Amino acid sequence: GPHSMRYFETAVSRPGLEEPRYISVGYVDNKEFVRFDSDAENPRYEPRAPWMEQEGPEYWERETQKAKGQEQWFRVSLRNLLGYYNQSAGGSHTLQQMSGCDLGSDWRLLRGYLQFAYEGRDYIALNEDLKTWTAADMAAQITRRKWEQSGAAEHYKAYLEGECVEWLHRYLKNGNLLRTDSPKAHVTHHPRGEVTLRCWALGFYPADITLTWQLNGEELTQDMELVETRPAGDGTFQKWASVVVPLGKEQNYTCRVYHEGLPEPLTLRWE
Protein backbone atom coordinates (compact mmCIF):
# COMPACT_ATOMS: atom_id res chain seq x y z
CA GLY A 1 0.00 0.00 0.00
CA PRO A 2 0.94 3.68 -0.18
CA HIS A 3 3.06 5.42 2.44
CA SER A 4 3.71 8.94 3.69
CA MET A 5 5.84 11.10 5.95
CA ARG A 6 4.81 14.38 7.54
CA TYR A 7 6.24 17.00 9.88
CA PHE A 8 3.69 19.18 11.69
CA GLU A 9 5.29 22.25 13.27
CA THR A 10 3.73 24.95 15.46
CA ALA A 11 4.95 28.18 17.05
CA VAL A 12 2.72 30.01 19.53
CA SER A 13 3.34 33.47 20.98
CA ARG A 14 1.42 34.84 23.96
CA PRO A 15 1.52 38.19 25.77
CA GLY A 16 2.77 36.95 29.13
CA LEU A 17 5.39 34.74 27.49
CA GLU A 18 8.44 36.52 26.07
CA GLU A 19 9.42 33.94 23.45
CA PRO A 20 7.10 31.61 21.55
CA ARG A 21 6.83 27.89 22.12
CA TYR A 22 7.86 25.68 19.20
CA ILE A 23 6.57 22.12 18.75
CA SER A 24 7.40 19.75 15.89
CA VAL A 25 5.81 16.33 15.40
CA GLY A 26 7.04 13.80 12.86
CA TYR A 27 4.66 11.28 11.30
CA VAL A 28 5.30 8.15 9.25
CA ASP A 29 2.20 6.58 7.69
CA ASN A 30 0.14 8.97 9.84
CA LYS A 31 1.60 7.65 13.13
CA GLU A 32 3.69 9.84 15.41
CA PHE A 33 7.34 8.77 15.46
CA VAL A 34 9.34 11.82 16.69
CA ARG A 35 8.57 14.97 18.66
CA PHE A 36 10.35 18.16 19.74
CA ASP A 37 9.05 20.70 22.25
CA SER A 38 10.87 23.91 23.18
CA ASP A 39 9.12 23.82 26.58
CA ALA A 40 10.89 20.54 27.37
CA GLU A 41 13.47 20.26 30.15
CA ASN A 42 16.33 20.20 27.62
CA PRO A 43 14.73 20.58 24.16
CA ARG A 44 15.60 17.61 21.96
CA TYR A 45 13.95 15.42 19.38
CA GLU A 46 12.73 12.26 21.09
CA PRO A 47 11.57 8.92 19.68
CA ARG A 48 7.83 8.42 19.96
CA ALA A 49 7.74 4.82 18.66
CA PRO A 50 9.96 1.92 19.80
CA TRP A 51 11.32 1.27 16.29
CA MET A 52 13.04 4.69 16.27
CA GLU A 53 15.36 3.99 19.23
CA GLN A 54 17.35 2.11 16.57
CA GLU A 55 18.82 5.44 15.43
CA GLY A 56 22.18 6.43 16.87
CA PRO A 57 23.01 9.50 18.93
CA GLU A 58 24.27 11.59 16.00
CA TYR A 59 20.91 11.19 14.23
CA TRP A 60 19.19 12.84 17.20
CA GLU A 61 21.93 15.48 17.43
CA ARG A 62 21.35 16.50 13.80
CA GLU A 63 17.55 16.54 14.02
CA THR A 64 17.75 18.57 17.24
CA GLN A 65 19.95 21.26 15.67
CA LYS A 66 17.50 21.43 12.76
CA ALA A 67 14.60 21.97 15.16
CA LYS A 68 16.52 24.72 16.95
CA GLY A 69 16.96 26.38 13.56
CA GLN A 70 13.26 26.01 12.76
CA GLU A 71 12.52 27.65 16.11
CA GLN A 72 14.54 30.76 15.24
CA TRP A 73 12.96 30.82 11.77
CA PHE A 74 9.44 30.63 13.23
CA ARG A 75 10.28 33.32 15.77
CA VAL A 76 11.40 35.78 13.09
CA SER A 77 8.39 34.84 10.96
CA LEU A 78 5.91 35.57 13.75
CA ARG A 79 7.47 39.02 14.12
CA ASN A 80 7.20 39.83 10.41
CA LEU A 81 3.62 38.55 10.38
CA LEU A 82 2.65 41.02 13.11
CA GLY A 83 3.81 43.74 10.75
CA TYR A 84 2.11 42.28 7.67
CA TYR A 85 -1.31 42.19 9.38
CA ASN A 86 -0.83 45.50 11.24
CA GLN A 87 -1.37 43.63 14.50
CA SER A 88 -0.35 45.40 17.68
CA ALA A 89 1.28 43.94 20.77
CA GLY A 90 -0.84 42.21 23.38
CA GLY A 91 -2.31 39.17 21.60
CA SER A 92 -1.81 35.48 20.93
CA HIS A 93 -0.64 34.28 17.52
CA THR A 94 -0.06 30.92 15.84
CA LEU A 95 2.16 29.85 12.94
CA GLN A 96 1.84 26.28 11.68
CA GLN A 97 3.51 24.29 8.92
CA MET A 98 2.97 20.92 7.27
CA SER A 99 5.50 19.26 4.97
CA GLY A 100 6.31 15.80 3.70
CA CYS A 101 5.89 13.38 0.85
CA ASP A 102 3.41 10.75 -0.34
CA LEU A 103 4.63 7.48 -1.85
CA GLY A 104 2.67 5.07 -4.01
CA SER A 105 2.59 1.34 -3.49
CA ASP A 106 5.67 1.21 -5.74
CA TRP A 107 7.50 3.50 -3.24
CA ARG A 108 7.81 6.22 -5.90
CA LEU A 109 7.05 9.82 -5.00
CA LEU A 110 3.42 10.67 -5.75
CA ARG A 111 3.35 14.21 -4.37
CA GLY A 112 5.10 16.56 -1.99
CA TYR A 113 3.55 18.95 0.54
CA LEU A 114 4.59 22.29 2.01
CA GLN A 115 1.89 24.45 3.60
CA PHE A 116 1.82 27.29 6.12
CA ALA A 117 -0.98 28.74 8.21
CA TYR A 118 -1.21 31.86 10.36
CA GLU A 119 -3.88 32.16 13.06
CA GLY A 120 -5.03 28.72 11.91
CA ARG A 121 -5.85 29.91 8.38
CA ASP A 122 -4.15 29.22 5.06
CA TYR A 123 -1.27 31.63 4.46
CA ILE A 124 0.89 30.17 1.67
CA ALA A 125 1.44 26.73 0.16
CA LEU A 126 3.81 25.28 -2.42
CA ASN A 127 1.87 24.13 -5.47
CA GLU A 128 1.91 20.49 -6.56
CA ASP A 129 4.38 21.35 -9.33
CA LEU A 130 6.82 22.23 -6.51
CA LYS A 131 7.86 25.36 -8.45
CA THR A 132 5.14 27.97 -7.79
CA TRP A 133 3.34 29.32 -4.73
CA THR A 134 -0.33 29.84 -3.86
CA ALA A 135 -1.18 32.63 -1.43
CA ALA A 136 -4.68 34.02 -0.94
CA ASP A 137 -4.31 36.86 1.57
CA MET A 138 -3.16 40.25 0.35
CA ALA A 139 -0.66 40.25 3.23
CA ALA A 140 0.70 36.91 2.00
CA GLN A 141 1.62 38.44 -1.37
CA ILE A 142 4.58 40.13 0.34
CA THR A 143 5.89 36.67 1.20
CA ARG A 144 5.09 35.14 -2.19
CA ARG A 145 7.01 37.91 -3.98
CA LYS A 146 10.02 37.51 -1.67
CA TRP A 147 10.03 33.72 -2.07
CA GLU A 148 9.51 33.83 -5.84
CA GLN A 149 12.60 36.04 -6.19
CA SER A 150 14.83 33.98 -3.87
CA GLY A 151 14.29 30.47 -5.26
CA ALA A 152 12.92 29.12 -1.99
CA ALA A 153 10.83 26.62 -3.96
CA GLU A 154 13.95 25.01 -5.43
CA HIS A 155 15.23 24.42 -1.89
CA TYR A 156 11.99 22.77 -0.78
CA LYS A 157 11.71 20.78 -4.01
CA ALA A 158 15.14 19.25 -3.34
CA TYR A 159 14.04 18.16 0.13
CA LEU A 160 10.65 16.77 -0.91
CA GLU A 161 11.98 14.87 -3.93
CA GLY A 162 15.20 13.72 -2.25
CA GLU A 163 15.61 13.43 1.50
CA CYS A 164 11.91 13.05 2.31
CA VAL A 165 11.77 10.00 0.03
CA GLU A 166 15.18 8.53 0.90
CA TRP A 167 14.60 8.74 4.65
CA LEU A 168 11.01 7.51 4.44
CA HIS A 169 12.30 4.46 2.56
CA ARG A 170 14.76 3.89 5.41
CA TYR A 171 12.06 4.34 8.05
CA LEU A 172 9.78 1.80 6.36
CA LYS A 173 12.55 -0.80 6.23
CA ASN A 174 13.37 -0.19 9.90
CA GLY A 175 9.74 -0.85 10.85
CA ASN A 176 8.65 -3.32 8.17
CA LEU A 177 3.90 -0.57 10.19
CA LEU A 178 1.89 -2.59 7.68
CA ARG A 179 -0.43 -3.59 10.53
CA THR A 180 -4.18 -3.05 10.30
CA ASP A 181 -6.76 -3.94 12.95
CA SER A 182 -10.15 -4.93 11.59
CA PRO A 183 -13.38 -3.62 13.16
CA LYS A 184 -15.39 -5.80 15.52
CA ALA A 185 -19.03 -4.82 15.13
CA HIS A 186 -22.27 -5.27 17.05
CA VAL A 187 -25.69 -3.60 17.05
CA THR A 188 -27.30 -2.41 20.28
CA HIS A 189 -31.03 -1.93 20.80
CA HIS A 190 -32.41 1.20 22.53
CA PRO A 191 -36.20 1.13 23.03
CA ARG A 192 -37.07 4.83 23.05
CA GLY A 193 -43.33 3.96 19.32
CA GLU A 194 -39.78 3.04 18.35
CA VAL A 195 -36.39 1.63 19.18
CA THR A 196 -33.05 3.10 18.17
CA LEU A 197 -30.57 0.79 16.43
CA ARG A 198 -26.92 1.69 17.01
CA CYS A 199 -24.21 -0.04 14.96
CA TRP A 200 -20.85 -0.18 16.74
CA ALA A 201 -17.38 -0.49 15.22
CA LEU A 202 -14.52 -1.01 17.68
CA GLY A 203 -10.87 -1.97 17.79
CA PHE A 204 -10.03 -0.91 14.24
CA TYR A 205 -6.92 0.75 12.83
CA PRO A 206 -6.43 2.93 10.83
CA ALA A 207 -9.20 5.36 11.78
CA ASP A 208 -10.76 5.63 8.31
CA ILE A 209 -13.99 3.60 8.30
CA THR A 210 -17.50 3.77 6.84
CA LEU A 211 -20.75 2.73 8.54
CA THR A 212 -24.03 2.46 6.63
CA TRP A 213 -27.58 1.35 7.40
CA GLN A 214 -29.84 -0.26 4.81
CA LEU A 215 -33.55 -1.03 4.51
CA ASN A 216 -34.33 -3.40 1.63
CA GLY A 217 -31.23 -2.49 -0.36
CA GLU A 218 -31.53 1.29 0.16
CA GLU A 219 -28.90 2.98 2.29
CA LEU A 220 -30.76 5.14 4.79
CA THR A 221 -29.83 8.78 5.23
CA GLN A 222 -33.26 9.64 6.72
CA ASP A 223 -31.51 10.78 9.89
CA MET A 224 -28.59 8.38 10.04
CA GLU A 225 -26.93 9.66 13.21
CA LEU A 226 -23.18 9.25 13.69
CA VAL A 227 -20.32 10.31 15.93
CA GLU A 228 -16.93 11.45 14.74
CA THR A 229 -14.42 8.61 14.82
CA ARG A 230 -12.67 8.69 18.18
CA PRO A 231 -9.58 7.03 19.69
CA ALA A 232 -9.98 4.33 22.30
CA GLY A 233 -6.64 5.44 23.75
CA ASP A 234 -4.80 2.18 22.95
CA GLY A 235 -3.99 2.86 19.29
CA THR A 236 -7.40 1.74 17.98
CA PHE A 237 -10.50 3.76 17.16
CA GLN A 238 -14.23 3.59 17.79
CA LYS A 239 -17.32 4.68 15.92
CA TRP A 240 -21.04 4.09 15.76
CA ALA A 241 -24.01 5.02 13.60
CA SER A 242 -27.71 4.78 14.38
CA VAL A 243 -31.12 4.83 12.70
CA VAL A 244 -34.64 5.52 13.94
CA VAL A 245 -36.80 2.46 13.32
CA PRO A 246 -40.41 1.43 14.02
CA LEU A 247 -40.47 -1.19 16.75
CA GLY A 248 -41.05 -4.85 15.89
CA LYS A 249 -39.73 -4.73 12.31
CA GLU A 250 -36.10 -4.73 13.45
CA GLN A 251 -34.89 -7.42 11.04
CA ASN A 252 -35.64 -5.14 8.06
CA TYR A 253 -32.49 -3.09 8.74
CA THR A 254 -28.87 -4.14 8.22
CA CYS A 255 -25.64 -2.35 9.12
CA ARG A 256 -22.56 -2.53 6.90
CA VAL A 257 -19.01 -1.66 7.95
CA TYR A 258 -16.24 -0.89 5.44
CA HIS A 259 -12.56 -0.82 6.38
CA GLU A 260 -9.29 -1.44 4.55
CA GLY A 261 -8.38 -4.27 6.95
CA LEU A 262 -11.48 -6.36 6.28
CA PRO A 263 -11.42 -9.15 3.67
CA GLU A 264 -14.83 -7.82 2.64
CA PRO A 265 -17.41 -5.43 4.13
CA LEU A 266 -19.25 -6.63 7.22
CA THR A 267 -23.03 -7.04 7.26
CA LEU A 268 -24.89 -6.85 10.55
CA ARG A 269 -28.39 -7.22 11.91
CA TRP A 270 -29.52 -6.82 15.49
CA GLU A 271 -29.58 -10.25 17.12
Partner: peptide, 4 residues
Amino acid sequence: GGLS
Protein backbone atom coordinates in the same frame (compact mmCIF):
# COMPACT_ATOMS: atom_id res chain seq x y z
CA GLY B 1 15.17 36.24 7.14
CA GLY B 2 11.87 34.44 7.66
CA LEU B 3 8.50 35.14 6.01
CA SER B 4 10.67 36.81 4.96
